[PDB]
């Protein structure tokens, strides 16, 4: 690791600076170095890790979608030919995206998940595992596609089971997990009815628990509830 010589605290400090500078690739590299120090991550540190990689992979996904669209049109009737370049460049971006997902999954497997005992950490990491397998599934087409989808499903399901037993229905991690697992059902697993049912039940159970919350917790929970409603509006 090129970060092996830098102090853990300095890596965390520089991750925060990289975020301020919108340098998310650097942010992710600093957080990878912090994880590789081998200590568990605090709540703030877990969110720095997730923010960094979500931004990196989100940019890769957007680029992959642009290139895949161009590639699809190139292979329609009417287009004569423009050579291998579109496929090659889509493949280049795809391979880089897969590499980032594999890196994140590797950090989760070595050894963040196995040391995570509290619900807030364990659910968070298992949600991430489902998310990064979902991003792999978005680009998958080969012998392993079904296994990639099932790896995402399995991680999300373990996170869901823990979240329902150990967190209140308004916990923002529980809400965000449900939001994303619902998107998995809709976009990956060809299960729109499960996606809609999960989003609706999550929203309604959260609504009923808002009365227990402070103003600040209410703000956090209702923010994610509005995303659930936004998706329900899109899908119905």
């Amino acid at each position: 690791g090129a970060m092996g010589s830098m102090e853990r605290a300095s890596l965390i400090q520089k991750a925060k600076l990289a975020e301020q500078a919108e340098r998310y690739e650097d942010m992710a590299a600093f957080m990878k170095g912090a994880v590789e120090k081998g200590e568990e991550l605090s709540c703030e540190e877990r969110n720095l890790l997730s923010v960094a990689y979500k931004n990196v992979v989100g940019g890769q996904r957007a680029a992959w979608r642009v290139l895949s669209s161009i590639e699809q049109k190139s292979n329609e009737e009417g287009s004569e030919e423009k050579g291998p370049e579109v496929r090659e460049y889509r493949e280049k971006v795809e391979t880089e995206l897969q590499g980032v997902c594999d890196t994140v999954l590797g950090l989760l497997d070595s050894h963040l998940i196995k040391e995570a005992g509290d619900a807030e950490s364990r659910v968070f990491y298992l949600k991430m595992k489902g998310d990064y397998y979902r991003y792999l599934a978005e680009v998958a087409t080969g012998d392993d596609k079904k296994r990639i989808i099932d790896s995402a499903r399995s991680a999300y399901q373990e996170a869901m089971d823990i979240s329902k037993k150990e967190m209140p229905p308004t916990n923002p991690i529980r809400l965000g997990l449900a939001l994303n697992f619902s998107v998995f059902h809709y976009e990956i697993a060809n299960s729109p009815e499960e996606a809609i049912s999960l989003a609706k039940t999550t929203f309604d159970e959260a609504m009923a628990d808002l009365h227990t919350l402070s103003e600040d917790s209410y703000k956090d929970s209702t923010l994610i509830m509005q995303l659930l409603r936004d998706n329900l509006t899109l899908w119905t």
Partner: peptide, 5 residues
Amino acid sequence: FPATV
């Protein structure tokens, strides 16, 4: 696309 966090 739908919202995720």
